[PDB]
Design a binder for this molecule. Structure first.
Ligand SMILES: NC(=O)c1ccc[n+]([C@@H]2O[C@H](COP(=O)([O-])OP(=O)(O)OC[C@H]3O[C@@H](n4cnc5c(N)ncnc54)[C@H](OP(=O)(O)O)[C@@H]3O)[C@@H](O)[C@H]2O)c1
Ligand SMILES: O=C(CCc1c[nH]c2ccccc12)Nc1c(C(=O)O)cnn1-c1ccccc1
Ligand SMILES: [Co+2]
Ligand SMILES: [Co+2]
Length: 159
């Protein structure tokens, strides 16, 4: 089973200049829970946005998409096609915008957390994929973070 997990603003933005433009500690403990134990696929630019410390993410098989045939990620498997990356039964694609859009044609699940911030879509932004009518989803209640931000959780499934 192949799924995608991302945090977005209402507009669709997920990253900006190598970073996520917010701080949602509760999502860290939610993201860690859903991915812990399995394989995680990220693109190279996303693998680079992680602090050296938490690189690689403990307890998980870190897989990095890249076209650089020489690119070495200390502690992660470097492949060159997502077909190469997608080999484990339960795999979670964790970013970024380029990888999310490449993987969705092949996911049965999506774990979305939407942050309530008024964040305009600047050119060159990393965006969240778009889900059509083929996606039946469940929504949770709006919650309120130790950061001071309202957010709600979305789970989608494709039969
Ligand atoms: N929850 C969130 O809000 C969230 C989650 C994760 C990341 N982000 C943000 O997302 C942003 C970056 O995402 P991005 O979309 O700009 O870059 P990305 O998707 O993170 O990875 C981009 C890299 O993936 C590799 N790649 C792309 N297509 C490929 C293919 N078909 N085969 C092999 N390798 C391929 C390339 O690496 P080479 O150039 O090495 O080939 C490309 O440079 C950052 O700002 C990050 O913080 C946010
Ligand atoms: O906090 C998160 C989640 C943030 C996040 C949401 N979607 C993502 C997609 C790709 C990469 C990270 C995210 N992960 C973890 C962990 C963990 O998962 O165990 C440990 N440290 N960190 C961390 C701490 C500070 C800054 C960054 C990462
Ligand atoms: Co699990
Ligand atoms: Co199903």
């Amino acid at each position: 089973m192949v799924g995608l997990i991302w945090a977005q603003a209402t507009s669709g933005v997920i990253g900006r200049g190598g970073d996520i433009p917010w701080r949602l500690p509760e999502d860290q403990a939610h993201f860690r829970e859903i991915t812990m134990g399995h394989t995680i696929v990220m693109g190279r630019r996303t693998w680079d946005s992680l602090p050296a410390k938490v690189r690689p993410l403990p307890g998980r098989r870190n897989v990095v998409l890249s076209r650089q045939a020489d690119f070495m990620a200390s502690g992660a498997e470097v492949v060159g096609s997502l077909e190469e990356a997608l080999t484990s039964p339960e795999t979670w694609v964790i970013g970024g915008g380029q990888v999310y859009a490449l993987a969705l044609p092949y996911a049965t699940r999506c774990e979305v957390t939407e942050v309530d911030i008024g964040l305009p879509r600047e050119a060159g932004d990393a965006l969240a994929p778009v889900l059509d009518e083929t996606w039946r989803g469940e929504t949770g209640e709006w919650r309120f973070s130790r950061s001071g931000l309202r957010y709600r959780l979305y789970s989608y499934h494709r039969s």
